[PDB]
Paper text:
Multisubunit Photosystem I ([name]) encompasses half of this Fe in its three Fe4S4 centers and is a target for degradation in insufficient Fe conditions, which reduces the capacity for CO2 fixation. TIDI1 (thylakoid iron deficiency induced) is an iron starvation induced chlorophyll-binding protein found in multiple green algae including Dunaliella spp. isolated from coastal Arctic waters and hypersaline ponds. [name] and PSII are each associated with LHC proteins for increased absorption cross-section, LHCA for [name] and LHCB (or LHCBM) for PSII. In this work, we report high-resolution cryoelectron microscopy (cryo-EM) structures of [name]-[name] supercomplexes from Fe-starved compared to Fe-replete cells of both [name] and D. tertiolecta.
Three subcomplex features are evident in the structures: the [name] core, consisting of all but one of the 12 PSA subunits encoded in the genome (PsaA to [name]); one crescent-shaped [name] tetramer made up of four LHCA subunits (LHCA1, [name], [name], and [name]) arranged from the [name] (proximal) to the [name] (distal) side; and one [name] dimer ([name] and [name]) on the opposite side, together accounting for all 6 LHCA proteins encoded in the genome. We lacked density for the PSAO1 subunit, which may be attributed to our isolation or vitrification conditions [Fig. 2A and SI Appendix, Fig. S6, (20)], since the protein is detected by proteomics albeit with undetermined occupancy in the [name]-[name] supercomplex. We identified densities for 170 chlorophyll (Chl) a, 1 Chl a’, 13 Chl b, 46 carotenoids (Cars), 3 Fe4S4, 2 phylloquinones, and 56 bound lipid molecules in the DsPSI-LHCI1 supercomplex. Although D. tertiolecta and [name] are separated by ~253 million years of evolution and inhabit distinct ecological niches, coastal Arctic vs. hypersaline desert, the [name]-[name] supercomplexes from the Fe-replete condition are highly similar, underscoring the high conservation of [name] subunit organization and antenna arrangement in the Dunaliella radiation. For both D. tertiolecta and [name], the arrangement of the [name] core and the inner [name] tetramer subunits in the [name]–LHCI2 supercomplexes is almost identical to that in the [name]-LHCI1 supercomplexes.
Residue numbers in the entry:
A (entry chain C): 2 to 81
B (entry chain L): 47 to 150, 152 to 203
C (entry chain E): 60 to 123
D (entry chain D): 60 to 202
E (entry chain B): 369 to 441
F (entry chain A): 12 to 751
G (entry chain B): 516 to 588
H (entry chain H): 69 to 133
């Protein structure tokens, strides 16, 4: 499916996982930020590429990046 | 409550309507050759092709380019209908080669259980036999529609 | 202690940031040793609408 | 969570009429999704693909075609009645997959029990140019 | 003659559009800034905003006054 | 139960909120950091739903908004009356309506505009108007410009009163929510009171004022010696000679001898041959019957005295088995949502405006209006477009209600819930019938185009070749022509001359003549049906899928007007209901453009023309029968055979129409920039321009930003509609003035 | 009139050059999106975030430039 | 009895290879017959020719051909 990557600029506001209506992102413990949290994407193959996490990302530039390509039956949002 | 889904489950799409819950509609659809599971695909193909090749001769004869020419409108219309029947037969063969290169894994799950193991229509050689029946029915219906314009008590 | 003075104007040299070669005001510098401890506030919003961003020690300098 | 729960086919379903928005042929040939929640009383909720339905007092079962429908229903339930539900994935061969609460504490929490995946320790924009990864099969962000 | 001129002019326009498109493809796909540092290409990319802004200025000025005189007449 | 609940002084009257432009929204109350703040300021200005969540404040806001719109309309009407009083040739037009073109706008001699003051006759120069105001001021008895001056001053006074009423009813004494929720009282007072009282007042004005003035006007009497209407009102002797029923003096009314009033309350079919409009006695009896029918209708609902109808009881009582609960929660929906009421009222207002356009091209209700082809064409086209715009807005505000004011707890198995439940079936069947109509309405045109281009006219779908005769429309025409013979024996003639057999003509020009319907009319009517079916498909799909969809199940939480949900699922651009309406504006534009093209060509080819002693000659020589079967024939014989006067209007009185034509071409073409393009390219170009302004320190404090995607779509559709409407307006008006 | 239509021709050439040059120079990076080089030459958009990023790629710059080329020719 | 006649009708063309070959042979045979022998017997107006029509062209003078 698509490729979702999270960079070290994330500060653990844990709102990118709320804006994603597909449970692609998850919050793991970290040590590189004050909140001690980092976005991770275990269920990346379930992503469609709606870029709602990029909308919800407050960092400049975006800590979570979604790259389109290699569409599938789950990445195309198909119920048929 | 006339409006309800089929078998009391709402999670499905299609729901049971008096258009579909009418006994006349249900027995008419079940007795159609396409839904006759106990018949060979070539026989239902023969019936379907006969009906469709009989109906296809009409518009070509009546509204053809040579419809004003007496005696040649019917011939041209019927051979164009036969050509259209051959085109549809080629489409049927291509669909049979396409959609049945794999194997189905589940049945149709008819009402109140009792499902047949596998519909012979939904196989590759079964759909090939269905296309063969369809084209045989198509040219036979076209030829019958031609001679129905050859002997006539009215119009054509 | 390890970064610029709080409230002092700094210049952001981060290329991918919206505020590249711009001036921002430091609001807090983290002392726990994180990746981007310097927190600055800009008077002009970005396209996302935010006005604050975090940068490393090497991405901030005193403007002339 | 503490123990992974298996869905029960014996749980009832909310009262709902026939809606054209719902399961399709993809629920047969491919996988489909099942959502389960426990309710204290009979309330009225809006289906993500249909109209309004009345949930039952107790366990509930909803079959939805996509995972996005299941998470939209989950977010609606959590925002409205703080339901905290969970949804599954049932394949065509009968395999049941657990999707939403893998740790049982939702993606908003951390639980200190999940590893980092698809995380780059470099900054965004520090990626190499596509010329540096040309004819390699790896994208600059995949490094 | 009219058909020949129109044909080769439209062909030329499409080919120039393809030239600029494939130059853009060069810039994104296989352009290595560390390979040619400080050369004409990197310097042109450095003040790209000036080139784009001046092209916008001359286009806006030409369109403004050309439409103004056409509407005036 | 029904009472006047009013809160006194809720809002102080001061300019504190005038100083800060962003005050209605908390998001816009901070400041304009970006340039999109201004567009959000002018966009969320009247959106009262997100300003506050209280329905009472919203109701007061929309009440004073309607008051302000009423004041604006009264100001505009008073201005039109003032223009008729001061800069007009109305006195000259009254003495010669068949030879003097109407004029009510006079331009200044400042720069080259003296050529726009065309020689309209009567020793007057000015813009040849097209609103038909002279015909209206001849229908209502109006002789001198003094009466127009008085009407203008009264309209200005009422506009000031309406603005003061809005100020008072908001800032000073604002009604409560229960005052607005008295739906039965509102319906009774706007059925018996507004509509019925206005119909009775207009019937009385027509009986006592308009009937004698119009009876003396078409008799050859000069308007100078025509007695003033107060003389008819006060003296029964003057009104008795024109109408002998006035000698009885209200005796037949109270004695049920209404047949004695058959001289000025007549029941006649057709038009007055002297003027070409409807008989004023027929209009008087019409408005009197309308007043009676609305006065009885306004005493239906129960408000305070026990008797009457309860609307909630009526809705909850109509329940039929294939619909589950029937109209169960619609009363609560329409008493708590302003947007659902707005959708219903806008749909019915638009449809009734369409009815107005059709029924005034068919039966001209004004003297010397049918012969004035420009006024009739302009009125038909204008009310065509207003009705279409109102219908599209009805779809938009229905979608807004669907997104915002809809709650699934109130309605479970009602009609609305079942409509959402089977929305896929509705949309699929509508798509099927749309495609079927498109094929068997446009492929016929393409096929006729081909066989014309293939040199085979005998294979056409035309009258000379094999034909599709509109048998149902012709049968209805024959039934309505023979309706006064059997089914309406008291009617003097047919209700209109669309299906008649007589050709009325005033001043040597055909007022209205029978319309023949053929294969081309069948093709164009089915094209109209196709276009309306596709437009209603788009609008209903936008309304139905506004809440949720199989693509985006959480579309309700994204709001009504959002650009997209990102490039996911292949790209969900234009997925909001707002963008469905945005496409609906274009489709209504196409539908109404084809409709008004059909109207103009059909009138100019088969109705409008100059009558001669040897037959009747039309404006165009009957080209609609033999040229409207093909798209190329439509093009060459309508858009190229006409519009030769628009291009050749330079140096004449209609040169401004050519200027308007080319400016409309510009605005229509300029819209496609905002329609094809996106935002990222324009944002990057704006970034380059910001760098340019940064180099020499002329950077604005407000950061320049590109227009939003919804903002860009709105600008594109607005410029497209403005360009197309003004293009058709200029072409139609120049063609109908230079020829008709 | 020849000189005026020549200036219209120059306007069309200048505007097509402006858009093609801006698409080429911003093909790999922009202030709205610094990482355009990682998304390929022909990608649809970046989403509704950051104000809206429709037609942000250099491919869409070429696509809009073909209209101006057609108008110029 | 009715099914047997059509069963033997289909058995020679039951394979998709056989039916593809049959439809190809009939299509090329019919298309080759058309024009060569299909036209000029139906009096198709493509194989007839003009009487004396459309030699000159150009209404603005020059009178080519
Ligand atoms: C024929 C229609 C039309 C017109 C007139 C324009 C005009 C313009 N486009 Mg273009 N464009 C069009 C169609 C059109 N476009 C289409 C169909 C597309 C394909 C999507 C594009 C794609 C496109 C791109 C991709 C770009 C342009 C750009 C431009 C500008 C070029 C600068 C110029 O020539 O000076 C100005 C030209 C004018 C004609 C001036 C118009 C303004 C006049 C003076 C009226 C101003 C208002 C007037 C005083 C009345 C005030 C009241 C009123 C506002 C209510 C200009 C604004 C470029 C741009 O904006 O960057 C500089 C650019 O990058 N356009
Ligand atoms: C709303 C519409 C309307 C109005 C205003 C009028 C008005 C009039 N009609 Mg008409 N009429 C109408 C509709 C209308 N009509 C319709 C629909 C028909 C059916 C076709 C007729 C048929 C008709 C006929 C056949 C005749 C009239 C006549 C009249 C006049 C006599 C008044 C009368 O009989 O009652 C007045 C009786 C009243 C009890 C009204 C009382 C009102 C007064 C002014 C109250 C004042 C109280 C005040 C507060 C105290 C003094 C104030 C002081 C300080 C100044 C009058 C000008 C007659 C006419 O022309 O005579 C000259 C006549 O012969 N009418
Ligand atoms: C000889 C010159 C030349 C060469 C070698 C290439 C070669 C290439 N270009 Mg380039 N290009 C050229 C000319 C050239 N192009 C011109 C003239 C234009 C302007 C129109 C472009 C615009 C262009 C863009 C914008 C892009 C490329 C891309 C590509 C690559 C793949 C394109 C391809 O084959 O897809 C095969 C494409 C098709 C089979 C589609 C054909 C449909 C055509 C184009 C539409 C024609 C309209 C109509 C249907 C024609 C029939 C009419 C009908 C009535 C019969 C390849 C590196 C792409 C790339 O590098 O990928 C990132 C890319 O993004 N080029
Ligand atoms: C018989 C009494 C009566 C009459 C005639 C009207 C008339 C009207 N009302 Mg209604 N209304 C009434 C009772 C009445 N109302 C009651 C009892 C309620 C409460 C249940 C409402 C609640 C109500 C709402 C909520 C709204 C209206 C609106 C309107 C206007 C609709 C616009 C239109 O059709 O253009 C017709 C336009 C004209 C004829 C122009 C002249 C307008 C004159 C000045 C109004 C005079 C009528 C008035 C009732 C006289 C008494 C007022 C007095 C205190 C001075 C119209 C003027 C709308 C509005 O705000 O517009 C004002 C609106 O949104 N009405
Ligand atoms: C009965 C009439 C009526 C009423 C009371 C409303 C009321 C409302 N509508 Mg609706 N609407 C209507 C008719 C109506 N509308 C019609 C007929 C249409 C079809 C075009 C629409 C289409 C529509 C949409 C698509 C939307 C609304 C929205 C709204 C809300 C805010 C509107 C606003 O702030 O605009 C602000 C006012 C302006 C922007 C000024 C209008 C200027 C336009 C764009 C150009 C006009 C140009 C003019 C014709 C010619 C000038 C030429 C120029 C050179 C000078 C409000 C609830 C919006 C909303 O959020 O709803 C909750 C929304 O999204 N409406
Ligand atoms: C005149 C320009 C035009 C045309 C022809 C179309 C055509 C179409 N649009 Mg579109 N539309 C347009 C502009 C246009 N669009 C624009 C500019 C917009 C933006 C606002 C839209 C917005 C829009 C929406 C929002 C919707 C459509 C829909 C449709 C479809 C209507 C189907 C139908 O009934 O027509 C019949 C089909 C035609 C007229 C196509 C031409 C067929 C001709 C007659 C040839 C017949 C077939 C031919 C013989 C086969 C040739 C074979 C050959 C390959 C060998 C169709 C695909 C609707 C849809 O999906 O279907 C209902 C829909 O919902 N369009
Ligand atoms: C023009 C095409 C065509 C061709 C090449 C054939 C050729 C053949 N068919 Mg056939 N058939 C045709 C048309 C054709 N038929 C038609 C129009 C019908 C009526 C629907 C039939 C019905 C038919 C049946 C029922 C049977 C044949 C059989 C046969 C074979 C023996 C010939 C015979 O008995 O004729 C007749 C031979 C392979 C028989 C066969 O294959 O025997 C094993 C057989 O059982 N055909
Ligand atoms: C073309 C569109 C066909 C729609 C067919 C279904 C209509 C919707 C439908 O099923 O309505 C069901 C309705 C009967 O249901 P009830 O009488 O219980 O509903 C009445 C209450 O809504 C009041 O029958 C009709 O409307 C018949 C006319 C259809 C035209
Ligand atoms: C001899 C003579 C003369 C002279 C002339 C001249 C001197 C000319 C020149 C000319 C020129 C001088 C021209 C030019 C042109 C150019 C162009 C046309 C360009 C284009 C470009 C492009 C297209 C680009 C691309 C790209 C990109 C985008 C990026 C990177 C890569 C590349 C580079 C590929 C005179 C007049 C004195 C006189 C007569 C004779
Ligand atoms: C157009 C216009 C105008 C003008 C004019 C007018 C409008 C006037 C007036 C009018 C009026 C002023 C009206 C009304 C009248 C009255 C009425 C309509 C009445 C009624 C009545 C009824 C309905 C009833 C009665 C009765 C009986 C029958 C018996 C006894 C009892 C009773 C009393 C109940 C103005 C400027 C204003 C404004 C703008 C527009
Ligand atoms: C052109 C364009 C822009 C750029 C347009 C912008 C930023 C709006 C510009 C509005 C101007 C500033 C209004 C004023 C115009 C003149 C200055 C008025 C002159 C008046 C005279 C009297 C001087 C977009 O932002 C956009 C966004 C989404 C889709 C398409 C497009 C799009 O096509
Ligand atoms: S693009 Fe959408 S589905 Fe994918 S990780 Fe981001 S928010 Fe979730
Ligand atoms: S091109 Fe624009 S409208 Fe379409 S999915 Fe991308 S950001 Fe949204």
């Amino acid at each position: 499916a698509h490729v979702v990557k999270i960079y070290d600029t994330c500060i653990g506001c844990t709102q990118c996982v709320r804006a994603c209506p597909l449970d692609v992102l998850e919050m793991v413990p970290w040590d590189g930020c004050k909140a001690a949290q980092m976005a991770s994407s275990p269920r990346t193959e379930d992503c469609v590429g709606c870029k709602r996490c990029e909308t919800a990302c407050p960092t400049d530039f975006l800590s979570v990046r979604v790259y389109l390509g290699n569409e599938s039956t789950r990445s195309l949002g198909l119920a048929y | 409550q006339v409006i309800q889904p089929i078998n009391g489950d709402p999670f499905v799409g299609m729901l049971e309507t008096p258009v579909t819950s009418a006994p006349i509609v249900a027995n008419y659809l079940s007795n159609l050759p396409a839904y006759r599971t106990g018949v060979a695909p070539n026989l239902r193909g023969v019936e379907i092709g006969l009906a469709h090749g009989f109906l296809l001769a009409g518009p070509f004869i009546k509204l053809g380019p040579l419809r004003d020419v007496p005696g040649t409108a019917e011939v041209v219309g019927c051979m164009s209908a036969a050509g259209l029947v051959l085109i549809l037969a080629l489409c049927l063969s291509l669909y049979g080669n396409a959609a049945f290169q794999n194997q189905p894994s589940m049945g149709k799950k008819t009402l109140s259980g009792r499902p047949l193991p596998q519909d012979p229509l939904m196989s590759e050689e079964g759909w090939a036999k269905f296309a063969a029946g369809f084209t045989v029915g198509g040219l036979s219906g076209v030829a019958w529609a031609y001679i129905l314009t050859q002997i006539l008590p009215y119009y054509s | 202690e390890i970064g610029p003075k709080r409230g002092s104007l700094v210049k952001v040299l981060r290329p991918e940031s919206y505020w590249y070669n711009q001036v921002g005001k430091v609001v807090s510098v983290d002392q726990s040793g994180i990746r981007y401890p310097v927190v600055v506030r800009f008077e002009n919003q970005n396209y996302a609408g935010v006005s604050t961003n975090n940068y490393a020690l090497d991405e901030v300098t005193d403007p002339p | 969570p503490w123990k992974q729960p298996e869905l029960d086919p014996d749980t009832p379903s909310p009262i709902f009429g026939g809606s054209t928005g719902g399961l399709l042929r993809k629920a047969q040939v491919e996988e489909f999704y099942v959502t389960t929640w426990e309710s204290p009383k009979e309330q009225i909720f809006e289906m993500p693909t249909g109209g309004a339905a009345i949930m039952r007092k107790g366990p509930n079962l909803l079959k939805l075609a996509r995972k996005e429908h299941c998470l939209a229903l989950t977010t609606q339930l959590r925002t409205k009645f703080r339901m905290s539900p969970c949804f599954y994935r049932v394949y065509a061969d009968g395999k049941v997959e657990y999707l939403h609460p893998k740790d049982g504490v939702y993606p908003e929490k951390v639980n200190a029990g999940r590893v980092g995946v698809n995380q780059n320790m470099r900054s965004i924009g520090k990626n190499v140019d596509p010329i540096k990864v040309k004819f390699t099969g790896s994208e600059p962000f995949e490094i | 003659q009219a058909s020949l001129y129109t044909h080769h002019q439209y062909i030329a326009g499409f080919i120039m559009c393809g030239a600029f498109a494939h130059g853009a493809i060069f810039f994104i796909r296989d352009y290595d800034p560390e390979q040619n540092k400080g050369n004409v290409l990197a310097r042109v990319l450095d003040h790209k905003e000036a080139i784009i802004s001046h092209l916008s200025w001359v286009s806006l000025f030409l369109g403004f006054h050309t439409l103004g005189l056409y509407v005036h007449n | 139960k029904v009472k006047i609940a009013v809160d006194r002084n809720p809002v102080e009257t001061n300019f504190e909120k005038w100083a800060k432009p962003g005050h209605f929204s908390r998001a816009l109350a901070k400041g304009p950091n970006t340039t999109t703040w201004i567009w959000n300021l002018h966009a969320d200005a009247h959106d009262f739903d997100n300003h506050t969540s209280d329905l009472e404040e919203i109701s007061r806001k929309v009440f004073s908004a309607h008051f302000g719109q009423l004041g604006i309309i009264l100001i505009w009407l008073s201005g039109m009356y003032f223009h008729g009083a001061r800069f007009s040739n109305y006195e000259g037009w009254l003495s010669d309506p068949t030879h003097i073109k109407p004029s009510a706008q006079v331009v200044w001699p400042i720069v080259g505009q003296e050529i726009l003051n065309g020689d309209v006759g009567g020793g007057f120069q000015g813009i040849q108007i097209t609103s038909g105001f002279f015909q209206l001021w001849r229908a209502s008895g109006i002789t001198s410009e003094l009466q127009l001056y008085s009407t203008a001053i009264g309209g200005l006074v009422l506009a000031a009163a309406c603005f003061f009423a809005g100020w008072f009813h908001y800032h000073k004494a604002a009604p409560k929510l229960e005052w607005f929720q008295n739906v039965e009282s509102m319906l009774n007072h706007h059925l018996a009171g507004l509509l019925g009282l206005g119909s009775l007042a207009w019937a009385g004005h027509q009986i006592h004022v308009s009937l004698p003035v119009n009876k003396l006007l078409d008799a050859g009497v000069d308007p100078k010696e025509i007695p003033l209407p107060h003389e008819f009102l006060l003296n029964q002797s003057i009104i008795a000679d024109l109408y002998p029923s006035f000698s009885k003096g209200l005796a037949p009314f109270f004695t049920l001898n209404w047949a004695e009033y058959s001289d000025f309350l007549t029941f006649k079919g057709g038009l007055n041959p002297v003027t070409g409009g409807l008989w004023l006695s027929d209009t008087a009896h019409h408005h009197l019957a309308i007043a009676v029918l609305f006065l009885v209708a306004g005493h239906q609902y129960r408000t305070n005295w026990g008797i009457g109808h309860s609307i909630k009881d009526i809705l909850e009582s109509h329940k039929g088995p294939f619909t589950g609960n029937g109209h169960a929660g619609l009363y609560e929906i329409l008493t708590t949502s302003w947007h659902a009421q707005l959708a219903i009222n806008l749909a019915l207002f638009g449809s009734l405006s369409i009815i107005v356009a059709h029924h005034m091209y068919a039966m001209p209700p004004y003297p010397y209006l049918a012969t004035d082809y420009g006024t009739q064409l302009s009125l038909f086209t204008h009310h065509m477009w207003i009705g279409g715009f109102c219908v599209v807005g009805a779809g938009a505000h229905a979608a807004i209600f669907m997104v915002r004011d809809y709650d699934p707890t109130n309605n479970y198995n009602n009609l609305l819930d079942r409509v959402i439940r089977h929305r896929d079936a509705i949309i699929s069947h509508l798509n099927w019938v749309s495609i079927f109509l498109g094929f068997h309405s446009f492929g016929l045109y393409i096929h006729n185009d081909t066989m014309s281009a293939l040199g085979r006219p005998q294979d056409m779908f035309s009258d000379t070749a094999i034909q599709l005769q509109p048998v149902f429309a012709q049968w209805i025409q024959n039934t309505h022509f023979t309706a006064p013979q059997l089914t309406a024996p008291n009617a003097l003639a047919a209700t209109s001359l669309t299906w008649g057999g007589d050709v009325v003509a005033v001043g040597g020009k055909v007022a209205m003549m029978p319309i023949a319907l053929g294969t081309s009319d069948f093709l164009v009517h089915h094209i109209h049906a196709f276009t309306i079916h596709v437009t209603v498909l788009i609008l209903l799909k936008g309304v139905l899928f506004a809440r949720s969809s199989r693509l985006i199940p959480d579309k309700a939480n994204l709001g009504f007007r959002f650009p997209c949900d990102g490039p996911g699922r292949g790209g969900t651009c234009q997925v909001s209901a707002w963008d469905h309406v945005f496409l609906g504006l274009f489709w209504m534009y196409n539908s109404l453009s084809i409709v008004i093209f059909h109207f103009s060509w059909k009138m100019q080819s088969d109705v409008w023309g100059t009558v001669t002693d040897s037959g009747v000659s039309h404006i165009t020589g009957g080209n609609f029968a033999q040229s409207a079967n093909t798209i190329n024939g439509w093009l060459r014989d309508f858009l190229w055979a006409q519009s030769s006067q628009v291009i050749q209007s330079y140096g004449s009185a209609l040169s401004a129409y050519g200027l308007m034509f080319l400016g409309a071409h510009f605005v229509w073409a300029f819209s496609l920039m905002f329609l094809f393009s996106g935002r990222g390219y324009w944002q990057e170009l704006i970034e380059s321009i910001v760098w340019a302004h940064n180099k020499l320190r002329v950077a604005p404090s407000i950061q320049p930003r590109a227009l939003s995607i919804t903002q860009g779509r709105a600008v594109g559709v607005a410029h497209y509609l403005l360009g197309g409407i003004a293009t058709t307006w200029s072409f139609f008006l120049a063609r109908i003035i230079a020829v008709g | 009139g020849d000189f005026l239509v020549h200036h219209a021709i120059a306007l069309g050439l200048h505007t097509t050059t402006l858009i093609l040059v801006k698409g080429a120079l911003d093909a790999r990076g922009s202030k709205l999106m610094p990482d355009k080089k990682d998304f390929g030459y022909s990608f649809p958009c970046d989403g509704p975030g950051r104000g809206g990023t429709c037609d942000i790629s250099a491919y869409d710059a070429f696509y809009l430039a073909v209209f101006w080329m057609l108008n110029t020719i | 009895l009715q099914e047997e006649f059509f069963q033997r009708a289909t058995d020679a063309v039951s394979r998709r290879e056989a039916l593809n070959g049959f439809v190809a042979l009939t299509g090329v045979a019919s298309i080759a017959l058309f024009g060569l022998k299909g036209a000029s017997t139906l009096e198709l107006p493509i194989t007839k020719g003009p009487r004396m029509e459309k030699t000159e062209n150009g209404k603005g003078g020059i009178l080519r051909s």
